[PDB]
Design a protein around this ligand. Structure first.
Ligand SMILES: O=c1[nH]c2cc(C(F)(F)F)c(N3CCOCC3)cc2n(CP(=O)(O)O)c1=O
Ligand SMILES: CCCCCCCCCCCCCCCC
Ligand SMILES: CCCCCCCCCC
Ligand SMILES: CCCCCCCCC
Ligand SMILES: CCCCCCCC
Lengths: 51, 47, 101, 98
């Protein structure tokens, strides 16, 4: 054998994480869709009762 | 002359396109091919 | 690995990992350093006069910065997806505009 | 007792021989003299018959392989970069716009 002309080693290969562009309505994530609708139905319900 | 062996299924030695136009070692292109040419030029022997 | 999407971490050599990341559609990347240490090398029949001058030529090419040039040419200067945005975009801690779009 | 000491102790085990942990009196490495054209350090000691082997991190190159037959490198070096640890900088004015 001659002198090593290139060094190497056992490396790890994982899937490159994408940019993960958030959705347009990403701000509606902390509250579920059921909560947002129930708020609107409770909003109109309180208004009619108040009237 | 000298007889030199190498492997093909690797990114080091590959079969360049249009191999029918070329012939012999001129058709084979790759990183390992350039290394063999530089070593043969430094030592000074045909292969 | 490309189909697992962050579930299968293949363990291969360094040179094959760098080539499959650059000279292929770069949907995967290499992370971390080498676990063990190996080394390639050209051979010569046992007891042949083509070992001394050949070994001196390999050390001469590696000293003159030739092997580093050939590696950077075949691994980076000829990649499939290339080096898009070579300057690594730092992770902005501030909130983006698309999050409240 | 260190890295090269343990390396020599392991080499002498697989290759049985009598060895003495001598230390070079010059403390230098292989350097060709300008006008004298004589080596120094471990290369100068091995070229003139002072030691039997050199268990030390000698950087292999062309100027040294022509006079001393090296072996397969047990470790690879690299010209790396060192910097201060990225500590938390002093938060200046207008820090509420973060
Ligand atoms: O064969 C060689 N092996 C060497 C090994 C080391 C280390 F192992 F890191 F101790 C160092 N150092 C790095 C920084 O300076 C202090 C000691 C110098 C080496 N040198 C001199 P160079 O060639 O000028 O680098 C050689 O010649
Ligand atoms: C009842 C209708 C509810 C529609 C909810 C749509 C939510 C979409 C979120 C991602 C948008 C990507 C453009
Ligand atoms: C998640 C789809 C419905 C979003 C409704 C948001 C209502 C906001 C005012 C209560
Ligand atoms: C972090 C210090 C920023 C200072 C900005 C001064 C701008 C003056 C117009
Ligand atoms: C699908 C939900 C639509 C809500 C429109 C706005 C109601 C106040």
């Amino acid at each position: 054998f001659s002198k090593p002309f290139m060094s190497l080693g056992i490396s790890i290969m994982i899937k490159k994480p994408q940019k993960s562009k958030p959705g347009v309505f990403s701000f509606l994530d902390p509250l579920a869709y059921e909560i947002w609708m129930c708020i609107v139905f409770a909003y109109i319900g309180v208004s009619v009762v108040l009237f | 002359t000298y007889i030199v062996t190498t492997i093909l299924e690797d990114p080091y030695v590959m079969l360049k396109k249009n191999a029918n136009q070329f012939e012999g070692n001129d058709r084979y292109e790759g990183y390992c091919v350039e290394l063999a040419a530089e070593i043969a030029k430094h030592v000074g022997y045909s292969y | 690995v490309r189909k697992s999407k962050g579930k299968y971490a293949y363990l291969l050599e360094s040179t094959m990992n760098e080539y499959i990341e650059q000279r292929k559609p770069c949907d995967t990347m290499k992370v971390g350093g080498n676990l063990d240490s190996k080394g390639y090398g050209i051979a010569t029949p046992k007891g042949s006069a083509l070992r001394g001058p050949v070994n001196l030529a390999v050390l001469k090419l590696s000293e003159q910065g030739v092997l580093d040039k050939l590696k950077s040419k075949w691994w980076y200067d000829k990649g499939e997806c290339g080096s898009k945005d070579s300057g690594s975009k730092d992770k902005t801690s501030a909130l983006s505009l698309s999050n409240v779009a | 007792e260190g890295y090269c000491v343990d390396l020599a102790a392991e080499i002498a085990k697989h290759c049985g021989f009598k060895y003495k942990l001598t230390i070079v009196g010059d403390g230098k490495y292989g350097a060709r003299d300008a006008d004298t054209k004589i080596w120094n350090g471990m290369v100068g000691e091995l070229v003139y018959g002072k030691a039997d082997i050199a268990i030390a991190p000698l950087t292999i190159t062309l100027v040294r392989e022509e006079v001393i037959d090296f072996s397969k490198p047990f470790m690879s070096l690299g010209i790396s970069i060192m910097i201060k640890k990225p500590q938390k900088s002093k938060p200046g004015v207008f820090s509420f716009l973060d």
